[PDB]
Symmetry: D2
Subunit: 379 residues, 4 copies
């Protein structure tokens, strides 16, 4: 019955057996001495196959999402690539979101399509659209919720029942919510994907990815690709991600509180046409978010009345929010998806409005963040 | 006209502009501040796409192999996976070696074949066999020389002419020789692959991979997959690999000298049936090795007269050589390919003899290594 | 008018000039290229003298304590040693606390006394005792508040007026409170000492120290000893400490809330004779703590009715609290000062009661911590 | 009977007991779980006191110098400070070299003299001057050989007999020679000092120090100061130093060969008045160097016929040699001691000639280094 914040510090992380070291060592090693041929020590043989620091991260992530197996990768994108290489083959079909991380769209449309996988982008906020989009060849439904960058909401349990009726897998990219806010496996998801670059590492200082699964056999198929394709998290990056995880609860509590205050400053600001945040009662899918999320996240998007020109000006004018790609760090970030993170979706069903600004609201003192936005919004 | 050892220390590695730091900093960062939307600083935007520490490693590797572009990956296997995902598609064919790293065989036969790529294993030491094995669908010839673990030799320039006559690419996995001993691009190869886990990092403490190319357009296609699939080397691992590269010349000189002495101790030892080393005049392909290699490497393989049982005993009895997977570190390693690194090729054309022992001869004091082998060989 | 949590993330930490990297690079370098003899780049010459990663930590710490200069060291003890070597000489006298970190007592009594510095331990909770203990040779009053391990309270502003009337310095070891809870320079202290090993690094994974001063000339004298004695924080440790600082506010808020709940569970528990916590209204110096501290900290000490035997049993029985030295990490720790951290004060004025247990209450889920203590206390 | 290069890789560095990891883990931890109060695991309790990564470095260094105990510090200067704080007290006297690292002079003259230690600088190349300079209060003779920067030579065995006849300790700062070239404890020294920043780490990327002793009781007194003053090497720096040590033999062989070639280019160059190198037969103390050194080192100093003005020009003109402080890295460095490393000795007995240039000859390709010097020397 251990609580989330306890598991984040302790799961996978018993003190070292030989020395008692209370923090997992950094096993910066490629290989391991065997006691006679095949006489493994502690089950280790070669670091791409398994590394003890990476094991601690994988076990911690599995505990936090309530899965049987975690797997850590060199980036979120590498987690996605290993997942799709494992579960798809030429001739298969994928349903993907109609609003998603540009890199997900690029991997599916520009690499996997060349390799014989078909796809359709669907409004995942409409179960009847997802049900209808199933094809005989569909192997998976790929869900982000909240979506990047509009923060639209998908009912994970509802979509799990649709996927499973079609003998398809439900994949949830839980990057934005993190395990602290949302636990897709508990609602029927088969696979959880993270970019640990974002909230799990939490400090804008590690690029990494992860998968967590409910089914041990699927976990073994994914681990075979983790080993054979080799897109693994290195031990030092894994160690920093695990260090970050230890404060996910306290960071996420502050991201959510600071984002609620930022939303209050944006709603009704005369320069702001629309505020996108799952916690607003009139946000599409608010009631689903209330069902499935502990709180509504640190991300806030909004549209400028004066269009792209006004949005580009706001993005250049902040002095506390930093203009950069990425999200989920302690530090506040701002960007223009149209020209930055989502320029890769221009011309597709996933194209983002040119008047949109995306915020990753950090854990700085909230009055500093509100004041910085208010001066940046002033024409 | 700068020499190899100079380039290994200096290429990609000018002192820091702001501070003069003589060693490349570790840019443990995920993202970069822009000066206005799209106003990149120094061309950086997001670490999976490019990171300044990874850039220094990539530029150094390109200089050492004489290529236009280097790309660093999370492991050798990830370099291979990104290469094959870029240059092949369903319906294509590959020629691979008939003696090769088990992970190469596993990736081609167990992942890419499922994804619609056909393959044949060929004796690359016989140009007429390679020429004959070309098919209309062949996109690449994949060469290891010396091969892992028998140390057979392939004439890179000869195979480049065969590949290019078929409008195919020549890929050379230059892991065993390293850039210090062999420079495949100078002999017509299109792509060089490394496991930097081995001699380039040099200290059995980093898992990593690299590609180097001669053609800038192929380099851009590979970089698109590096970014989109995301199997990148992290900055700290990249930094340790680069640190290792600085001593490649002096380490490799000592590996070669110590391996020549170990060969002298094994040849004619009454328990040893055969010694495999490119530098022995009667080794198959010795004259080609003399042509294309500065020296003959740190790897030595040998077969035991008393069969698998004798080989397993030798592997358990060394006290200085460590029984482990991997190779190319300062420390001496021993293994039994049949049951360790090449158990994955059992039942295929690449199956290794059960009486074979593989040594990675390290840079310890040579009399200690010879004495350790001599006591381990004593029945 | 920037807030603490903003400064913790941003002070000393502008994005990199050349690349925009949003996180300070790890300048793992010993030296720096000069443009002509004495042509320094960015003022750097040799890492013991100054290193850019260590500078960012030093500037951040100075901002958080409101000082003009910060200095980072290899450990808290090294910060203390460099401080005392700078401000004292043979023939000088120090006033130290009558309850203090055992290492402080050991450094003063077992090293500095041999080197000709006299000392007296005084009850710093009694201003009239401190005033009375001044001698003509007294150069400094060394204050911990709250004290390690009894958590007694000293009125910093009152003691600053006593020190300054005697032309002596007031030194406050602010390790337990951290800059987030208490800012001694704002109350007249001359020097703040930290063990950054504790709450500032926050993750039980770095040993480090710091000094912060109000007066630039004293800062230059300390920096001369930092350079000349060389007990510097290395850049990677400095970088991890700085990463930890980014979450000090959210960690400390949770440590304080969880400690208040633990205090409620201990007060009136039939096995517990006394609970020591600054936030209890009847704790000696509570009203001073209310004046000078934002909140009352994560440390809680308590005495067992059944004596040393009962205290040793509790310390061995916890399953969530880990039995270890140290404090201020995310993870909960328990120890017995009498036999562990304060065995070095046995036989002195600083001897700790044998029936005392010290807790560093971490940020795990509070019900898990309360339940673990309650089962450990059950006879 | 194990050889130096074997010990450098293996001593202190058995594979990990639990996992077999062939490289020592990075124990980035502050503390260690105890099994009951005082139930240490593997003897560890708190990282300032001992850390397993720092232990491996300390054990390796002890093996390489043939001592009973090694101790690692935050810098060379911190090793020196802990040594002198341990072995001296007010009223004691030290003999120091008349040519030495400026930081040694600064620590003795500007810190320890204030703390009541007297000193004299003596020509250590003249045993009769050292014998004569002994005073009743002399506690140690501090020897550098070769000296920084003139490369003068002291007969360690001769000076050990003088020190021991006076019941004084002989301290040898073995930084320039390293353990691979010179083993002072084997010639009667009591303590060896290193800056591991230089040849031991070898890559200009770690600041660190070490002590090695022959007598276990002196080792315990030094360890008490290591713990109590806390100027320890952190685990990551210790780990990089240990990685560097693994290639000391092959790096030093190349430094010596490249320095011999550079000496040949400087001797008789019309712009060069004098070349200082222990290997030149007419260098003062050459025959002693032949006795006590395996080879003559990577350092080369020389005086310019055209004086300071010519020396400053050479230092600014090199394109391969980098103008910077420090020495002992793979990369070649040049400096002007008068204005850079030894400006701190201006006005003392240790003042360096203004026409002197110091080279740390690196392991780059020797023709590149000779050509770079020859163009820099051209007026
Ligand atoms: Mg364990
Ligand atoms: Mg540059
Ligand atoms: Mg800056
Ligand atoms: Mg061991």
């Amino acid at each position: 019955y251990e609580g989330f914040e306890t598991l984040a510090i302790h799961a996978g992380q018993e003190a070292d057996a030989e020395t008692g070291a209370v923090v997992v060592p950094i096993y910066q090693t490629s290989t391991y001495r065997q006691d006679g041929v095949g006489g493994l020590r502690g089950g280790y043989e070669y670091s791409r196959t398994a590394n003890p620091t990476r094991t601690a991260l994988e076990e911690c992530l599995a505990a936090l999402e309530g899965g049987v197996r975690g797997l850590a990768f060199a980036s979120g994108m590498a987690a996605e690539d290993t997942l799709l290489r494992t579960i798809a083959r030429p001739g298969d079909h994928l349903i993907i979101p109609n609003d998603a991380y540009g890199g997900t769209f690029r991997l599916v449309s520009k690499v996997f399509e060349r390799w014989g996988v078909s796809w359709d982008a669907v409004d995942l906020s409409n179960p009847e659209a997802v049900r209808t989009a199933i094809r005989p060849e569909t192997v998976a439904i790929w869900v982000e919720t909240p979506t990047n960058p509009l923060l639209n909401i998908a009912d994970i349990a509802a979509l799990a029942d649709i996927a499973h009726a079609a003998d398809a897998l439900l994949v949830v990219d839980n990057t934005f919510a993190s395990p602290y806010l949302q636990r897709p496996l508990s609602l029927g998801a088969d696979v959880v994907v993270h970019s640990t670059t974002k909230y799990l590492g939490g400090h804008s200082d590690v690029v990494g990815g992860a998968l967590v699964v409910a089914d041990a056999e699927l976990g073994e198929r994914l681990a075979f690709h983790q080993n054979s394709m080799g897109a693994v998290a290195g031990p030092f990056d894994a160690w920093l991600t695990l260090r970050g995880i230890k404060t996910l609860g306290v960071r996420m509590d502050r991201h959510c509180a600071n984002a609620e205050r930022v939303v209050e400053a944006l709603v009704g600001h005369p320069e702001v046409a629309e505020v996108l945040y799952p916690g607003l009662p009139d946000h599409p899918g608010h009631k689903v978010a209330v069902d499935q999320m502990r709180a509504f996240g640190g991300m806030v998007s909004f549209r400028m009345r004066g269009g792209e020109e006004a949005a580009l000006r706001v993005c250049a004018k902040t002095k506390v929010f930093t203009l950069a790609e990425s999200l989920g760090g302690v530090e506040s970030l701002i960007e223009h998806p149209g020209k930055m993170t989502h320029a890769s979706t221009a011309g597709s069903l996933l194209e983002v409005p040119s008047d949109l600004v995306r915020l990753s609201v950090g854990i700085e003192t909230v009055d500093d963040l509100v004041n910085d936005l208010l001066q940046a919004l002033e024409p």
